Amino acid sequence: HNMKAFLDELKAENIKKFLYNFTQIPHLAGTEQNFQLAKQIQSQWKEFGLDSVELAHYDVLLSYPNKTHPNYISIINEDGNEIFNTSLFEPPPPGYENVSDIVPPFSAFSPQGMPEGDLVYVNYARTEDFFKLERDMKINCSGKIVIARYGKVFRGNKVKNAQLAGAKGVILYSDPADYFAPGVKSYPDGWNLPGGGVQRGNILNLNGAGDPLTPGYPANEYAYRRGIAEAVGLPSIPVHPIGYYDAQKLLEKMGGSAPPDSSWRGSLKVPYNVGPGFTGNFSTQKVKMHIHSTNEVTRIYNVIGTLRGAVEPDRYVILGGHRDSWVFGGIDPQSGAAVVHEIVRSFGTLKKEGWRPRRTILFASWDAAEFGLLGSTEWAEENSRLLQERGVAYINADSSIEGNYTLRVDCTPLMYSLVHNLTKELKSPDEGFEGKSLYESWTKKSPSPEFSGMPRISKLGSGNDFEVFFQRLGIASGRARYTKNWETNKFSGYPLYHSVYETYELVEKFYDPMFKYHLTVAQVRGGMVFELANSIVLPFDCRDYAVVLRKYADKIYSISMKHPQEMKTYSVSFDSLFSAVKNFTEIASKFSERLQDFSNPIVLRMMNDQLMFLERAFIDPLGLPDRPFYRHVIYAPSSHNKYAGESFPGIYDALFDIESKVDPSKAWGEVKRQIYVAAFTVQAAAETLSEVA
């Protein structure tokens, strides 16, 4: 019973069977079908051999369309006649045209409204897109309906940006530029998005809060709930998503200003005029939204499985991923959930033969991730004290594949060495790399920008269920999946994301017919869990944090140095931060020497506790400015794009667009404050690795 036994037990055919089983009907959060799937998973995890498997339920704010009053958008003439209406549903794929309970496309948590007005096209609705409109083009979005293409940033940030620009509504659409790869056919013939396809997704700005009504505390049976007016993260203006057939109709009549440059033009046969409003002949026509969705407190269910550790049962290694889907969840999340299911099965086979991991492994099937990471966050709020003092690591397990090209890993620097070592042990599934390691194929296909002979590993961003564990609680986190070639494919994500077309057949026909990429991902996620739960010394290398901290310090200093006059005027010095990073580097090096130079289980566990609490040391209990649930001082989700990670976020946000601030003395004062907080936190984290007494 070693890692090889665990790995060898994983089977592609099992992952295939589980994926098929999980994707025959929709599993929307808060629905009966998703409760039944939770009960099935609970039963199977018990069968598979886990020590305990429970459901943890919460009552959280969810959002659904009104089944008898559908959402749609119109072009309306001056008489009030609706002369064009957007679709009421996506044409269902072959053999699913009789499937019931497919939720039609909608933006979850949109308020109700029927706003009428003139359109302004805002490109991707990024911060810089709105800068270009108001500052350079002098276009006023106030009282306008904005139309934005999906892509580049999280859609909740688009909506926040549109609100702040004074928009009265937002229309989101999928442009073929961003969702249709040249030379591939539309579903069901290929993996591209058809013109009737639409991307569902929530538009909250929760900043880590979890259920909008219960920030800080689990939404249990006696929870006190905020009123809707005080809820966290809800949009103030109606929002609705459409496909590119419907978008073309809305965009084709657009007048006003030309697009400012080619980066504003998608691939539709329209001019991409910014507006406001339509060209001369249609100038009296307007666009009207009709949104009737309702927010409702609804029960959700996480499944929590425990495999008790033999030696350190009070140390938890957690493998978690969500179960709820927008429709069938063929990739998101069931390609991930099928992998977790097979990993549980494999650990359980070893357990039945008398083996136990050194540390406790917790397995989680989270609910309501699509509605704002609600299930993972409520459970972590409930269990924060246990997780704070006992949580070794969290490995996420959403979608296993978004392409068939190479591995994609995002994780804390503490797991870099673990990932390098594990992938050197695993077989590459790639064509042309038979008999070579996964490390070799991954490194060849995705080279590190910094280091020759090393693969790319990214920072954690957000938009997935590791957020509460990593940026709120400070537990070392990672994730891994298979991805496309991010060089020859300028579309980002996979085209059928959050559409009805994301099915079992999509995966089996077009992504991974042999389930070998799924198997490789199971080996990586499972292998990481195995090493974290079984290695005598925790498999974290603090020296890797020292390297990245210096990179991040150089980066933030370089941003500040675009303003040398102000740094002179306000005596803005990064000396303290570089000093702290130098100290961290020195102390980490000495700790590493002791770790290899120390029979003594107290010294071991003392050292294991130092390793475990190192990620924890980057937590500031006061949080980042106006984002109390983003507490990690090194990493936070970008304030402009929840999906992307930002390093030294407190300093970064203090410097962002600083030349536009009215009171530079105050603005640079806050930069200095954030430098002090970051330097202090880095030094304090370093000192947790010093000799204890």
Ligand X SMILES: *[C@@H]1O[C@H](CO)[C@@H](O)[C@H](O)[C@H]1NC(C)=O
Ligand Y SMILES: *[C@@H]1O[C@H](CO)[C@@H](O[C@@H]2O[C@H](CO)[C@@H](O)[C@H](O)[C@H]2NC(C)=O)[C@H](O)[C@H]1NC(C)=O
Ligand Z SMILES: *[C@@H]1O[C@H](CO)[C@@H](O[C@@H]2O[C@H](CO)[C@@H](O[C@@H]3O[C@H](CO)[C@@H](O)[C@H](O[C@H]4O[C@H](CO)[C@@H](O)[C@H](O)[C@@H]4O)[C@@H]3O)[C@H](O)[C@H]2NC(C)=O)[C@H](O)[C@H]1NC(C)=O
Interacting residues toward a second copy by CB under 8 A: 51, 216-218, 220, 222-224, 306, 308-309, 311-314, 316, 360, 382-386, 389-390, 575-576, 601-602, 605-606, 609-610, 613, 616-617, 620-622, 628, 669, 672-673, 675-677, 679-680, 684-685, 687-688, 692-693
Contact pattern from residue 153 through residue 192 relative to ligand X, giving x for each residue in contact according to CB under 6 A and a dash for the rest: --------------------------------------x-
Closer to ligand Z at the Cβ: 159 or 679? 679
Please state, as a whole number, how many other Cβ atoms lie within 10 Å of the Cβ of residue 325: 29
691 binds ligand Z (CB under 6 A): no
Query: According to CB under 6 A, which residues from 3 to 32 bind ligand 28Z?
Result: none
Distance separating alpha carbons of residues 515 and 509, to the nearest angstrom = 11
**Position of tokens 């002791």?**
594
Write down the least CB distance from residue 389 to a second copy, Å.
5
State which of residues 80, 91, 95, 143 lies at the interface with ligand X (CB under 6 A). Answer: 143
State which of residues 643, 648, 652, 668 lies at the interface with ligand 28Z (CB under 6 A). Answer: 643
207 binds Ca ion (CB under 5 A): no
Write down the least CB distance from residue 435 to a second copy, Å.
40
Q: Is 602 exposed, middle or buried (CB count within 10 Å of its CB: 0-12, 13-18, 19+)?
A: exposed
- Considering CB distances under 5 to 8 angstroms, the limit depending on partner class, which of ligand Y, a second copy, ligand X, none binds residue 536? none
336 binds Ca ion (CB under 5 A): no
Distance separating alpha carbons of residues 369 and 29, to the nearest angstrom = 8
- Considering CB distances under 5 to 8 angstroms, the limit depending on partner class, which of Cl ion, ligand Z, ligand 28Z, none binds residue 404? none
DSSP code per residue over 197-252: ----EE----TT--STT-TTS---TT-----GGG-SS--SS-EEEE-HHHHHHHHH
579 binds ligand Z (CB under 6 A): yes
541 binds ligand Y (CB under 6 A): yes
Best CA proximity match to 285, nearest among 72, 74, 71: 74
Closer to ligand 28Z at the Cβ: 464 or 647? 464
Q: Is 533 exposed, middle or buried (CB count within 10 Å of its CB: 0-12, 13-18, 19+)?
A: buried
Q: How many residues bind ligand Y (CB under 6 A)?
A: 16
294 binds ligand X (CB under 6 A): yes
Structure tokens at 414: 């503490």
Query: According to CB under 6 A, which residues from 623 to 682 bind ligand Y?
Result: none
683 binds ligand Z (CB under 6 A): yes
**Position of tokens 């976020």?**
649
Closer to Cl ion at the Cβ: 323 or 479? 479
Q: Is 488 exposed, middle or buried (CB count within 10 Å of its CB: 0-12, 13-18, 19+)?
A: exposed
- Considering CB distances under 5 to 8 angstroms, the limit depending on partner class, which of ligand X, Ca ion, ligand Z, none binds residue 214? Ca ion
Write down the least CB distance from residue 84 to ligand Y, Å.
6
Best CA proximity match to 488, nearest among 523, 551, 445: 445
Distance separating alpha carbons of residues 447 and 449, to the nearest angstrom = 6
Q: Decide if 379 contacts 366 (C-beta within 8 A).
A: yes
User: Which residues on adjacent β-strands are paired with residue 477?
Assistant: 394
φ/ψ of 290, rounded to 5, equals: -135, 100
Give the list of residues 6+ apart from residue 621 with CB closer than 8 angstroms, or none.
631
Q: Near Zn ion by CB under 5 A, which window of 54-62, 117-125, 231-239, 394-402?
A: 394-402
Write down the least CB distance from residue 590 to ligand 28Z, Å.
35
Write down the least CB distance from residue 658 to ligand X, Å.
21
- Considering CB distances under 5 to 8 angstroms, the limit depending on partner class, which of Cl ion, Ca ion, ligand 28Z, none binds residue 396? Cl ion
- Considering CB distances under 5 to 8 angstroms, the limit depending on partner class, which of ligand Y, Cl ion, ligand X, none binds residue 421? ligand Y
Distance separating alpha carbons of residues 620 and 631, to the nearest angstrom = 5
Pairing mode, if any, of strands 641-647 and 116-117? unpaired
Query: According to CB under 5 A, which residues from 359 to 398 bind Ca ion?
Result: 381
Closer to Zn ion at the Cβ: 463 or 664? 463
From residue 245, alpha-carbon distances to 82, 85, 194, 686 in Å are 17, 11, 9, 56
Query: According to CB under 6 A, which residues from 165 to 224 bind ligand 28Z?
Result: 201-202
From residue 489, alpha-carbon distances to 177, 178, 493 in Å are 11, 10, 10
State which of residues 40, 43, 142, 236 lies at the interface with ligand X (CB under 6 A). Answer: 142
Distance separating alpha carbons of residues 320 and 324, to the nearest angstrom = 13
- Considering CB distances under 5 to 8 angstroms, the limit depending on partner class, which of ligand Z, ligand 28Z, Ca ion, none binds residue 493? ligand 28Z
Helix (H) or strand (E) holding 322: strand 312-322
Q: Decide if 522 contacts 438 (C-beta within 8 A).
A: no
Contact pattern from residue 547 through residue 576 relative to ligand Z, giving x for each residue in contact according to CB under 6 A and a dash for the rest: -----------------------------x
292 binds ligand 28Z (CB under 6 A): no
65 binds ligand X (CB under 6 A): no
Best CA proximity match to 407, nearest among 449, 366, 369, 448: 448
Closer to ligand Y at the Cβ: 414 or 577? 414
Pairing mode, if any, of strands 476-483 and 406-411? antiparallel
- Considering CB distances under 5 to 8 angstroms, the limit depending on partner class, which of Zn ion, Ca ion, ligand X, none binds residue 511? ligand X
Contact pattern from residue 393 through residue 422 relative to ligand X, giving x for each residue in contact according to CB under 6 A and a dash for the rest: ----------xx------------------
Q: What is the CA radius of gyration of the chain?
A: 25
541 binds Zn ion (CB under 5 A): no
- The 10 Å CB-count burial string (b at 16+, else e) for 167-184 is bbbbbbbbbbebbbbeee
447 binds ligand 28Z (CB under 6 A): no
Q: Decide if 82 contacts 75 (C-beta within 8 A).
A: yes
Provide the binding-site residues for Ca ion, judged by CB under 5 A.
210-211, 214, 219, 381
Provide the binding-site residues for ligand Z, judged by CB under 6 A.
221, 576, 579-580, 583, 679, 683
Provide the binding-site residues for ligand Y, judged by CB under 6 A.
21, 24, 40, 43-44, 74, 82-85, 417-418, 421, 539, 541, 596
Provide the binding-site residues for ligand X, judged by CB under 6 A.
66, 68-69, 140, 142-143, 191, 294, 403-404, 484, 510-511
